[PDB]
Amino acid sequence: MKPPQFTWAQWFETQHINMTSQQCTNAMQVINNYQRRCKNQNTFLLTTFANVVNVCGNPNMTCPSNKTRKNCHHSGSQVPLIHCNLTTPSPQNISNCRYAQTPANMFYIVACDNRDQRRDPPQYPVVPVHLDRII
């Protein structure tokens, strides 16, 4: 579920690339305030958006999440990341949700697609739209 003002690529960048704080509880407030609920888990890749776009250029592979999709690509190398896990759910006041954080170095598989014709910049014809899995 993504807010209407975001294209899938912009939402991917907001959820998985732009960690606004090195603390999960603070970083997650952005995502949660946009989604209007506390995400149970979320992974932030400590890499650049451009680096992910390059991964879209790697060979196509089956998405481990949706075995019916073939628009996934393997990162090739490990990247540092931070996984946030909800420790304190608060369905009445989402700004009070608290998260644990786990640093790691792993590979990732991303799904890519053609850019949003009207709203995504022409600079990147192919963009990441879903973080399918970290291995």
UniProtKB/Swiss-Prot annotation:
**Tissues expressing this chain:** Liver, lung, spleen, leukocytes and body fluids.
User: Which top-level enzyme class is recorded in the Swiss-Prot or TrEMBL entry?
Assistant: lyase
> Catalysed reaction(s)?
an [RNA] containing cytidine + H2O = an [RNA]-3'-cytidine-3'-phosphate + a 5'-hydroxy-ribonucleotide-3'-[RNA]; an [RNA] containing uridine + H2O = an [RNA]-3'-uridine-3'-phosphate + a 5'-hydroxy-ribonucleotide-3'-[RNA]
On modification after translation, the UniProt record reads:
A particular signal processing and glycosylation pattern may differentiate the UpI2 RNase, found specifically in pregnant women urine, from other nonsecretory RNases.
Q: State the active site.
A: 16, 130
Q: Which UniProt keywords apply?
A: Chemotaxis, Disulfide bond, Endonuclease, Glycoprotein, Hydrolase, Lyase, Lysosome, Nitration, Nuclease, Signal
Q: What Gene Ontology terms describe what this protein does at the molecular function level? A: lyase activity; nucleic acid binding; ribonuclease A activity; RNA nuclease activity
Residue positions the entry lists as glycosylated: 8, 18, 60, 66, 85, 93
Please tell me where substrate binds in this chain: 39-43
Single GO BP term: defense response to virus
Task: Give the EC number(s) listed in the UniProt record.
Answer: 4.6.1.18
* GO (cellular component) term, any one: extracellular exosome
Localization per Swiss-Prot or TrEMBL = Lysosome; Cytoplasmic granule
3'-nitrotyrosine PTM sites in chain numbering: 34
Which residue spans traverse the membrane?
none
Q: Does the keyword Transport apply?
A: no
Family statement: Belongs to the pancreatic ribonuclease family.
| Comment on protein domains | The N-terminal region is necessary for mediating chemotactic activity.
How this chain assembles, per its entry, is: Interacts with and forms a tight 1:1 complex with RNH1. Dimerization of two such complexes may occur.
Function, in words: This is a non-secretory ribonuclease. It is a pyrimidine specific nuclease with a slight preference for U. Cytotoxin and helminthotoxin. Selectively chemotactic for dendritic cells. Possesses a wide variety of biological activities.
Protein name per Swiss-Prot or TrEMBL: Non-secretory ribonuclease
Gene name, Swiss-Prot/TrEMBL = RNASE2
Q: Which residues of the full protein are shown?
A: 27 to 161 of 161
